[PDB]
Amino acid sequence: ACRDKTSANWRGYSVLVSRYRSLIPNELFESLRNISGEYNINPQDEHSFF
């Protein structure tokens, strides 16, 4: 089911990434790094999201 869900819904997420990537410049694309570690996902969210 996880492979089936991703193979169907990837086009929408591809456009969404494209829209938001247009906001950030190349310098921010090359420099920003995850340091605070606040964006961590619980294992329950991984298997429920997919």
């Binding site: 089911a1 997420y13 990434v17 996902i41 969210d45 298997h47 429920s48 999201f49």
Partner: protein
């Protein structure tokens, strides 16, 4: 915005393949028990950020 489609159809497909029973203890119950979509939007944002 996202679409709102019930995962009953997906659960039934998963239940039938694993032969899940009410009166037994199987591993499929533990996966099925904790399918929480409450924290979905935050995981969606994390996916785009990656």
């Amino acid at each position: 915005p996202v679409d709102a489609r019930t995962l009953q159809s997906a659960t039934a497909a998963l239940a039938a393949d694993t032969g899940q029973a009410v009166n037994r203890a199987q591993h499929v119950s533990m996966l099925t028990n904790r399918l929480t979509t409450a924290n979905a939007p935050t995981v969606r944002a994390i996916t785009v950020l990656t």
